[PDB]
Structures are given as C-alpha cells and as structure tokens.
C-alpha cells in the first residue's frame, strides 16, 4: 500500500500512514519515485533516508513501499552488464532514455524482461520430485562462455508441481512451480536477494587452490588462493591496472565482478572504456571478457547510498555465481572511497564519530564483507564448489597505513601486493614492492605444491631469503662499497639482480610473457636458484684453496649461461609448449652443470 | 506549464535567524521558491529549507530583518529554483542568483534548467583526451589540462590565485594546432576583487566567451550555495547542448564551503570534522563531477576549482576532499610569491593526473611529454643543488651542478615567470622549455629519448 | 572444551552476551562441578566494539575514543569472574585475547583491560617481523600474581631474583641499542657490548621457543642463568649475594 510524505528536510523524508513498514525496507518517495531507505520508525510514521535529491518532493506525495530491503535482482542478463551500486542498469538507462543523465528516480528493471533466453530444464526433474534450496532446475545458455545455472532461491523448497519444457523464456515467465505443505510458489528465472544478508552455503572450506594471475611476482612470491582475500594500494603511477586486467584476462576465475564504489568521474570512465576492449582466449577463439565480467561501477557524485551499497551488491552477485559453482573474483576499486561513503552516511545520521572520524562499526563492516569471501561447497543438490576471491584495493593517505580503513583492511585481509609507484618509476613492471608485500596463504598452499609442483616450495623460501639478504647487502655497499664484499655475497648481489631484472620483472605487453604459466615460473626460479647454489658452492669449496673462485671468474667463464638465464623469459607458452619449455630449461640446467663442473 | 495561481500567505508563525516559519501552508514543496513582501514594501526571495505537515521553513536570502508575523506576506512560487539558460548569457556578468549586474536585460531563456541537474551517466562519460591551453606556461607545459579534467589551483590566502584565475579566463582556448566558452564563478569574492574580474574581462576583449557570476563577500550565503550550481548549469547547457567546449573556473571554493557550513548550521545539523558538514564530500562532488566529455556530444566541461587553503594545511577538509574528487593540483606558492615570481606556480608539488591524455602528436606536439619530464627532473635536481650549495660552497660545486643551478635560475625566471598579460601558446612554452634544456649537453637529458633529442635539440 | 562462536558475520549485539555465557558455564563447571576451567575470550576488541555500537545507538556519555563511559565497569563485569573461591576446589583462569588497535597500548581497550586484569602478556610486531616465536616482548608484560606464585617451595628460590635481573638486563640492552643507533659501535664501552650480547642471546635462547616446546620452569630459570652469567657479578645489581654465591657459579 501507499504511505504519504509528511516532511522533508534534506534527504530525510518523514512519511505518515506507514504502519506496516519494515525497518531498512526500501520505499519509492514522491511522484518521481526517488529511492529511500527506512532508517527509523515511530508510531505509524517512518523516517526515510532518500538516496536521490529531494528537491521538489512535497507534503502529501505518495510513498510506494517496496516489499524488500536493499536487494539485488539475480538472474540471466547480469553478464556484461554495468550497474550502479543500487543495481540500476546504466547500460540500459542510457539506451532507453537517450540521455547522458541518470533520470532522477529512474525505475529501469535491473535485468531486462524483454530479451528471450534459451532455457534447458534439468533432465531428471519432473512433477512430484523433491527440490531443495540451491538446486539447479535448469540451465540458461547465457553466453558461449557462461552457462548460467538457474537455481532455486535459498529458503525455498518443496515438490515440483510444474517445470517448464525446454525453450525460449524471459525473466517474466513462471519457469517452475513448487509445492510445500500445500502452499504453492511460482519461480521465474529471476530471484531477489538482500545485499546485506550472506547467501547460505552447505559448508565453507579452507582456501586451498592458487589464484593464478600470470604475473610471476604474484604467483610465486605472494600467492592468493581461490576464495582468498587480498589488498592492493591504489595510487597514481603505481599501476593497479595491471592486477585488475591480469585477473580479468588470465586468472582462472570463471567469473569476474568489478566494483567502483565511488571512483573519480574520469577514473571510472577509463575502466568502463577499457573493460569491454579486453579479450581472452577460450577454446582457441578470442572472446571479450565482458562475456564473463559484470561491473558495479559508479562515480563520486552518485547517491551516497549507492557508493556504500556497491561493495555489498558486488559481493552478492559474486555469491550468486559462487553458488552456481563458478570461481568468482571480485575486485573492489577503492574500499577507502566506500569507507568515506560509510562515514558520510554515518555523519548524515549523526552517529557518534569513532576513531579519526569514521563510524563506530567500520572495522566490523569490513570484517564481515571480507568474511563473505571463501571457497564453499555450494548449497543445493548437484554437488558443487565455488568461490569468491575479494581483491579489494585500499587507498592510504600518501602511503600512511595507519588510517582506520587501511589498518583494518590489512588486519582482515590475508594477502597484500603493495604496488609501488617508485618501482613503476624505475620501469619495473609489475610494481609489486616484494618487501612490503606479503601472503599468509603459503602454509595452506604447501599442500597443493607438494602435489603439483613439488620443488616450488624450497625455491620460494630461497628466493625471498636472497632478496632479504640483498636488503642488507645494499647498506653494506653504502658503508664500504661493492668491492668490499666477499665473493659469496657478491654472488648474492648479482643473482639477486638477475631475479629482479629477469624473474620478478615482466613486461605485460609482450606476446611471450604477458601470461606466465606456473610451470614456467617454477622452472625459471628453479634454474636461477640452481645457479645461485652452484656459484655459492664454487666459492665456498675453493675458499679452502689457492684457486679460489670469484664472481669475475664465474661471469667471464659462464657469460653464455648468464645470458641464457636472462633470456629464459622469452620462452613463449603459446608457441613453445610446456614440454618444450621444460626441456629447454633442463638443457640450460645441463649446460650450467657442465660449465660449473669444467670450472671445478 | 504551471497554470494554477500562486498562494500568498500572511501566516508567518516565527522568525528565527535567517528562517521564516509559515504555517497552514497548502501542500508545501521542499526547495520551493518563495517571494515574501515585508511590511514596508520591500521584497526578498527565500527557499523552503524544510517542510513538515502544514509548516514550511523559508530561508530568506536576505536577512530576516524587518520581517514580522501579521504583516509579512509570502508568495509560494510553486516550483523549485530554475535557471534560465541561453547562449545570450555568454558575454554577461551576473550576481549570485542570476540577476544581471552589467545593466543588460534579464536573460531571455532558451530553457529553464533545474540547477541541481543530474549526475552524468558514468557509462556515457568519456575520457578527456585533448588539451585546453591556459596560456600560463607553468601549467600548459608541465601540468597540461585534458578536455574534461578537473584540476584545482590550491593557494593560500594572499597569494595571487585570483590573478591567475583571471589570466586563465582571459587567455584560455583550444590549441588551434572557435567553439570555446568560459564560465567564471566567483564565490565569496570581496568587492575589489569582483570589480577586478569584471573590468579585466571587459577590457581585455575576452568577454565574448565569458559568462561571469559574482557572489560578493557580503551577498547572501544562500546565493553563494547556488552560484556554483548556476555556473555549472549554464556550463552543461553550453557544453552538452550547444556543443562547445566550456571551461568552468570556480573561485574560492573555501568561501563556498563556508556558506555550506552556514546553511548546515541554519538547518541545525551538528558539525562534522573541523566544523564542516559530514556530507561536504557528496556536495563538493556534486559540484565538481558535473564535468567531462560525454559520448555522442562534441562538447565538454572542464573545471578549475580554486581553493584558499586555511593555514596552508593540505590536510584541511576542503583541500583533502577536493583532492579526492578532482584529478590533480596546482600549487600557488608563498616562497615564489615573496621572491616576486608570477605566476607563483610551484611545479614540484603540482600534478595533473590526466596530462598524459592532453599531449603528444596531434594534440600539442611530439615532444611535449618528454620536455615536461625533463624540465621537472632538471628543476628538481637544481633545487637539490641549490640546497647543497649553501652547505658545500660554490667552488666545491662541479660544472654539472653549475649547469643545474643556471637552469634553475632560468627556469624560475624565463619559464615559470610570465607576467599577467603575456599569452604563450603551448608551442611557445615548449620552445622556451627547449631553450632551457639546451643549457645541458644532450647526454644529461637522460629522460628524453634520442629520437626526440636528435629532432628538437639543435638550433 | 566447550566452544562459543560468534564468527565475523554473526550478529554484533550477540557478542555482548557471548563472554557472559562462556563465563557462566565456566562458573558452573568450576564452582559447582569443581573443574579447573581456563577461559579464553578471543578478540575482546571485537567485543568492545560491539559495546561501542550499542552504547552509541543509545547515545551514552562517551569516554576516550568514543567507547562508552562505563566500559571499565563492563570489562570488569567480564574479567572479575575469575579466581578461586573459599571451600571450592575449582578455579577460573582467564586469558582474554585482544587486538590492540594500531598496536597502541594507550588505546581504551588495552588500557582499561590493563587496569582491570592481573597483568598482560604483550605480543610484539618488532619481534614477529624478525620471526621470533613466541613474540612475547617481556618488557611491557606483567603478571601481578608472580610475586606470590614463585619462591621457596613453589618453583625455586632464585626465581624472583632471576626474573628481576633479566628484566633489568633486557631493559639496559634495549637502551644500549637505542644508544648505538646514535653513536655507532665505536662509542660503546665493553659493558654496553656485554648488554647487547645479553639482549641477543636473550631473544635467541629465552624468548625464542618451539611452537610445540614445553619448557619446565626449572629449565627456563637455568636458561635465565646461562644469560645472567654473561655478566660479572657486580653488574647483577638486582640479585643479593646469598642468591648469587649459590646459583651463579655452576
């Protein structure tokens, strides 16, 4: 039913005749149907925080009470879509209204009802068969790349009374009907879910499998796990573009979700102008990753409730795909700007300001949001595993990690990649700092490496230890100069520079190593650490002799080997197959063995 | 069109500061405009600050002095505030609320636009691309502005940020390697400075392009609140409907934020950080983010907010939030000003996050990015050497360091220093840059590629 | 073991009562069933912030950093449900765990917990980043019932002196490090070098410990003596002669 507006003071509208309204329900205020959220009740009145500008609302304006809290509409048509945080489809608003503005109080259906989809019912299901929350009663052929799986809503169950035969249907068609305790329920391809309620899962599981990014520095030294959580400092010259695009194009994530959560205007324009242009190879054909990516993108002048709802809308879409059993990867583009949206809403509500001005519950909200991540055994009958990997960025003030948003983010998250404008300046792409960066999933992933890449773990330890050693050898050089270092630590320095320049450095625009498979990465680091150990052996076993070996001897004697190691990059996975690259690296190992032996 | 006749109430039930409370109002609108007649015949506008039931709280633009119950009448205009927009207002000077103050006619509207406008659809916004040249070398060469960028000129109280703004207004234009328009909007500008703007633009021939809004320091602070929105509404008309590249120069956004504070306190909200409202971020965003290029329309809106940073504290809410929303910063610097350099634009902390789109072949010239990088590097190394000189002494300096000191001198004296009425195209700024970079032999210009050094360096 | 779980996304206001459920079960087991109960309360920071959430919604008078004015009383209502009772064989040890925000021990949660509890075991980033385990930075740690829980006939009779001397030597070693940060190795005298040697061997031998290593109190005291022997007697100013002459030599 309708209430009526009884007051308006800025965004705070006060509505009478709303006896039954539910707290935190959404309402459509005014003749233009501006969105508002019931932030309070009193008697039979209600206070409605109107998201959009209230200029022009008048006393007596009808208030249409939406039946559901801030919710996302989940169904076919999400993929390739662009949404404001409130789930307003911008790529349909602009097209339908032929205007560059978001009409005040627009009411475009989030998922188009007009477009027909191809629906194939689950062959086993029939009338009378029992069906439970999360079951897949059919598949919608959304794309060449995402076979959408139509699922019963959680909290819905019963006996099948009608299942539509295979054919063309749209979100408006009742595709299934089920019966429970005699009560009947009709289900179309589109369900609804509150953005602030965690979608249920049969069982969460330990994050256990690598999230490949194709970047060597990320996949080797600082892994994230499908279902893990990550942080990325966002800055001007750092180049978060690299991580976002690597996850979108080359990650093993079956689906990608982006969140803007209040970017700058033109900064968001860049993302929306780029992402459609990105492409991925699938089954030997070039495909646009917008067949597997959805963008909750919005700028800073959009409603504050839109910026704050962006994180939750994104994570709810990602949980929908997780439930279907895909390995979603959800990237938030500034949780600092989302946190400022939160601070603004708290200020509008006049809550007590907590640490450094942010609300009392910023830490709890961040904790719950990231906790929504994870690798789960999805609900429902067809056994499935999905995941949602939250790679949300955070924007410290000038690199100061002490502000509440960054500090809580680094306390909650388990991986942190620390992109560095200084390395970008030095022309080191990726700009991963490899000293501030860290990954807490290494213990969890030892299980996987001991199965697939048995020899990667010692190489990881040794590489990080080499680089940490160099961190002090540099100060030794400053104190007494490079000529003053023992030969062993000279070898440390030259191999560390080799790793910096030809392992951790990866030009992302080349064909050969835009994407670096993990077998190639472990092979590269294996050969480099083999050289390190062999040089250390050569120096250490001749320290007891007059024929003591030196870095100068090693370089002048093995320049070919050093050039080969430096060139290991160019081995192209697309043309030089796995077997060929493995054999080439093993041949490099053979040549290096022979060279060290002939020196010895 | 609104046919129905307006209701005029004598039912004033209170007058509390800048607010007049009217009761028994029929279906009040929020943000409705009101024209209220004082007992003595005077007239004052007001905006319905709040509404509840049969009550309406009218923020009278001018003070409430002389208002009373029982004799003040209050006509309700039945609609929100709307600005009349045309091209005719290109080449006019208006006060804070759209009233002409150049002794011209009242604007004959081509349309009536709601001054709050709507947010540009992020899926319709486009990347800025080509350059807007301001003539001021210190920002054309080193901090160029792409069409659609929002870049604020930070400055402390007393620095010539107003003079720099006037120079930008008088000189700006397309790179012309004629559909350009300017919307100046002075908020809280004292009478002498407002007169400076008006007479300067009138005298230096630029008035054909410039629509100038003035909210004098002693005009109503609500008119200050609505001035930036009038400016930007005209800018949106001239850009996304008349398809001409607009440059919006909002002046003293600190004086705007003070008016925002006054209106909040009038609403009786509790203060946020440093006394400013909590929603100042959304509000400043609503002002700034009415900018940028839009797909399918050959116009755009560039902005150059100008900020008086209190206490020179870059952490203060105004500059902090403005940095969050905008895409750069141009520092007007007190040490340069005291040394009597103009424009005292300190190019070391200044930045333009979208300069990389406004330069290059076909937009300014092949060597723009390289010359900018090299000038920045040599300027910074020169500042380093100048700090070191006083410690080690001049004769302890190497010849290269003397080259850098000479470059520092001539960069602060020939490139940064411009004089108010000297207009340098971007090409001229680049050639001055080269005349400075030739202080060094080519091998020292390490950030310039050889393919450029060989082409431009000689002569 | 009897677990109560309020995971990160479970309701916030329920954390207010979760500690009280846990301590009520602990009291039923200890004071009526006579078990020796050890209570753990994980992330009393995540509790105090639930407290701040409710108190803010109530608009109660705030203390420091927005936390309610009565957080001391509430934290004490939790903590002071510990100790042993006359005539009842059970006990309720408590080991609250709390995340000090920004590692700032002046933050209201750690500060009030310090005023209410009987000590604190302080876990240190400047050691965890060096990969010492456990990273217990003893210098700000405290245990108010050590003074009576140690001595003759309970553990050993050197325990108090050994502990006090290790505290003093550790403190002076830290001060010597802070001094060499200014004046470099050259300016240090042999006594400062002795203290730095003690500090190194203390963080390497005494603090550093296997995650599954179970050192007896006697082993810990003997390892303390191996370090006190780094010094000549007269630099062990906190230990009296009767103690020194018996334990120092061996």
């Amino acid at each position: 039913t309708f209430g009526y507006v009884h007051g308006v003071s800025g965004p705070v509208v006060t509505a009478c005749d709303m006896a039954g309204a539910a707290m935190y329900e959404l309402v459509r205020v005014g003749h233009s149907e501006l969105v508002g959220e019931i932030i309070r009740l009193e008697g039979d009145m209600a206070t409605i925080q109107v998201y959009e500008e209230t200029s022009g609302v008048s006393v007596g304006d009808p208030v249409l009470r939406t039946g559901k809290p801030l919710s996302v509409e989940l169904g076919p048509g999400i993929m390739g879509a662009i949404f404001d945080g409130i789930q307003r489809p911008l790529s349909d608003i602009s097209s339908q209204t032929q205007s560059i503005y978001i009409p005040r109080g627009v009411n475009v259906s989030a998922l188009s009802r007009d477009i027909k989809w191809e629906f194939i019912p689950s062959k086993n299901l029939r009338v009378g068969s029992h069906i439970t929350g999360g079951d897949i009663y059919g598949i919608v052929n959304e794309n060449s790349l995402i076979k959408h799986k139509i699922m019963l809503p959680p909290r819905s169950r019963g006996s099948v009374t009608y299942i539509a035969p295979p054919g063309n249907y749209d979100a408006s068609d009742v595709v299934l009907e089920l019966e429970f305790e005699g009560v009947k329920e009709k289900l179309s391809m589109v369900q609804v879910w509150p953005v602030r309620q965690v979608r249920p899962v049969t069982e969460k599981l330990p994050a256990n499998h690598p999230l490949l990014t194709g970047q060597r520095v990320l996949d080797a030294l600082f892994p994230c796990v499908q279902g893990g959580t990550t942080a990325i400092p966002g800055a001007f010259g750092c180049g978060k573009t690299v991580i976002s695009q690597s996850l979108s194009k080359y990650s093993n994530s079956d689906v990608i979700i982006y969140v803007g959560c209040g970017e700058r205007g033109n900064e968001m324009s860049e993302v929306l102008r780029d992402f459609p242009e990105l492409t991925m190879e699938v089954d030997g054909k070039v495909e646009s990753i917008m067949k597997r990516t959805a963008l909750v993108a919005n700028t800073s002048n959009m409603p504050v409730a839109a910026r704050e709802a962006s994180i939750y809308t994104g994570i709810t879409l990602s949980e929908y795909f997780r439930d279907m059993g895909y390995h979603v990867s959800m990237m938030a583009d500034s949780t600092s700007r989302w946190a400022e949206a939160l601070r603004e809403i708290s200020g509008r509500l006049a809550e007590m300001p907590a640490d450094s001005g942010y609300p009392a519950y910023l830490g709890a909200r961040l904790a719950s949001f990231y906790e929504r991540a994870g690798r789960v055994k999805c609900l429902g009958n067809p056994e499935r595993e999905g995941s949602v990997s939250i790679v949300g960025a955070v924007s410290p003030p000038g690199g100061d990690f002490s502000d509440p948003v960054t500090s809580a983010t680094l306390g909650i998250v388990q991986v942190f990649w620390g992109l560095d404008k200084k390395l970008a300046q030095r022309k080191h792409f990726p700009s991963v700092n490899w000293l501030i960066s860290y990954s807490k999933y290494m213990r969890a992933l030892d299980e996987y490496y001991d199965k697939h890449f048995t020899e990667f773990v010692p190489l990881r330890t040794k590489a990080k230890e080499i680089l940490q050693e160099e961190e002090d050898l540099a100060e030794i050089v400053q104190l007494v100069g490079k000529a003053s270092l023992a030969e062993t630590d000279k070898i440390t320095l030259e191999v560390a520079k080799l790793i910096k320049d030809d392992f951790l450095q990866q030009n992302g625009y080349t064909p050969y190593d835009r994407f670096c498979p993990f077998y190639k990465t472990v092979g590269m680091l294996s050969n480099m650490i083999s050289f390190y150990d062999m040089a250390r052996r050569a120096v250490e076993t001749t320290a007891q002799s007059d024929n003591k070996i030196t870095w100068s001897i090693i370089r002048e004697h093995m320049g070919e080997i050093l050039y080969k190691l430096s060139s290991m990059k160019f081995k192209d996975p697309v043309k030089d197959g796995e077997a060929k690259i493995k054999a080439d690296y093993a041949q490099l190992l053979e040549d290096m063995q022979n060279a060290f032996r002939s020196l010895e | 069109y609104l046919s129905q006749p307006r209701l005029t109430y004598k039912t004033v039930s209170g007058v509390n500061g800048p607010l007049v409370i009217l009761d028994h109002v029929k279906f009040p609108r929020y943000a409705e405009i009101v024209h209220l007649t004082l007992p003595d015949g005077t007239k004052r506008s007001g905006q319905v600050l709040e509404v509840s039931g049969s009550k309406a709280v009218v923020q009278v633009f001018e003070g409430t002095s002389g208002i009373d119950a029982k004799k003040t009448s209050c006509e309700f205009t039945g609609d929100i505030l709307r600005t009349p927009v045309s091209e005719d207002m290109l080449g006019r000077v208006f006060n804070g609320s759209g009233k002409p103050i150049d002794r011209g006619p009242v604007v004959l509207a081509e349309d009536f636009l709601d001054i709050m406008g709507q947010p540009i659809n992020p899926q319709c916004r486009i990347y800025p691309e080509e350059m807007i040249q301001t003539g001021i070398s210190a920002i054309d060469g080193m901090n160029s502005i792409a069409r659609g960028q929002k870049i604020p000129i930070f400055s402390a109280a007393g620095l010539p940020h107003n003079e720099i703004a006037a120079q930008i207004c008088r000189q700006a234009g397309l790179v012309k390697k004629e559909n350009f328009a300017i919307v100046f909007a002075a908020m809280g500008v004292n009478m002498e400075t407002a007169r400076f703007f008006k007479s300067d633009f009138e005298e230096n021939g630029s008035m054909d392009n410039v629509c100038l809004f003035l909210n004098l320091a002693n005009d109503p602070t609500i008119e200050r609140i609505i001035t930036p929105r009038l400016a930007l509404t005209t800018a949106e008309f001239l850009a996304y409907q008349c398809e001409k590249h607009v440059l919006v120069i909002l002046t003293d956004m600190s004086s705007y934020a003070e008016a925002l504070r006054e209106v909040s306190a009038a609403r009786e909200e509790v203060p946020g950080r440093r006394g400013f409202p909590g929603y100042m971020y959304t509000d400043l965003a609503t002002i700034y983010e009415r900018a940028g290029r839009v797909e399918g329309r050959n116009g755009s809106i560039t902005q150059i907010p100008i900020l008086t940073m209190p206490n020179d504290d870059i952490t203060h809410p105004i500059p902090d939030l403005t940095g969050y929303i905008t895409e750069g910063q141009i520092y007007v610097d007190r040490q340069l000003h005291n040394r009597q350099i103009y424009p005292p634009i300190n190019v070391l902390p200044s930045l333009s996050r979208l300069m990389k789109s406004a330069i290059g072949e076909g937009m300014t010239r092949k060597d723009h990015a390289d010359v900018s990088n090299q000038l920045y590097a040599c300027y910074a190394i020169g500042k380093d050497v100048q700090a070191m000189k006083a410690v080690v002494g001049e004769e302890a300096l190497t010849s290269d360091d003397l080259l850098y000191l000479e470059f520092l001198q001539k960069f602060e004296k020939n490139f940064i220093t411009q004089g108010p009425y000297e207009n340098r195209t971007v090409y001229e700024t680049l050639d001055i840059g080269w005349q400075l970079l030739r202080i060094f032999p080519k091998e020292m210009l390490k950030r310039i590629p050889q393919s450029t050094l060989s082409e431009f360096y000689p002569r | 073991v009897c677990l109560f779980l309020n995971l990160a996304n479970d309701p916030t206001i329920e954390r207010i009562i979760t500690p009280r459920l846990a301590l009520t079960t602990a009291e039923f087991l200890a004071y009526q069933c006579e078990k020796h109960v050890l209570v753990i309360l994980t992330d009393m920071s995540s509790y105090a912030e639930a407290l701040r959430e409710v108190s803010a919604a109530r608009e109660e008078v705030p203390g420091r950093r927005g936390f309610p004015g009565y957080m001391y009383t509430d934290l004490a209502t939790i903590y002071e449900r510990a100790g042993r009772v006359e005539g009842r064989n059970g006990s309720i040890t408590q080991i609250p765990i709390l995340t000090m925000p920004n590692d700032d021990i002046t933050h209201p949660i750690p500060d009030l917990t310090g005023y209410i509890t009987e000590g604190q075991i302080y876990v240190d980033r400047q050691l965890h980043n060096r990969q010492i385990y456990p990273p217990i930075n003893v210098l700000p740690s405290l245990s108010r019932l050590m003074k009576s829980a140690i001595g003759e006939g309970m553990t050993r009779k050197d325990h108090a002196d050994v502990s006090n001397q290790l505290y003093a030597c550790y403190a002076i070693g830290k001060d010597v490090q802070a001094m060499k940060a200014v004046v470099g190795e050259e300016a240090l005298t042999s006594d400062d070098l002795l203290y730095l040697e003690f500090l190194q061997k203390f963080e390497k031998n005494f603090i550093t410990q296997g995650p599954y290593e179970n050192r007896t109190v006697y082993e810990t005291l003997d390892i303390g003596w191996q370090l006190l022997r780094i010094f000549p007697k007269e630099m062990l100013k906190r230990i009296p002669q009767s103690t020194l002459s018996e334990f120092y030599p061996r």
Binding site: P353 | V270, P271 | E59
Partner: peptide
C-alpha cells in the same frame, strides 16, 4: 559533538513538552 547532540535532544524534548 556529544554536547551539541545532547543540546539538540533536549531542544526536541522541549518541543514535546510544549506541544
């Protein structure tokens, strides 16, 4: 902030007391 919030609440209560 707390003092001003308290004053505002007391003014609201005064409105309720008067009306």
């Amino acid at each position: 902030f707390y003092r001003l919030k308290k004053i505002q609440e007391k003014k609201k209560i005064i409105k309720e007391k008067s009306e």
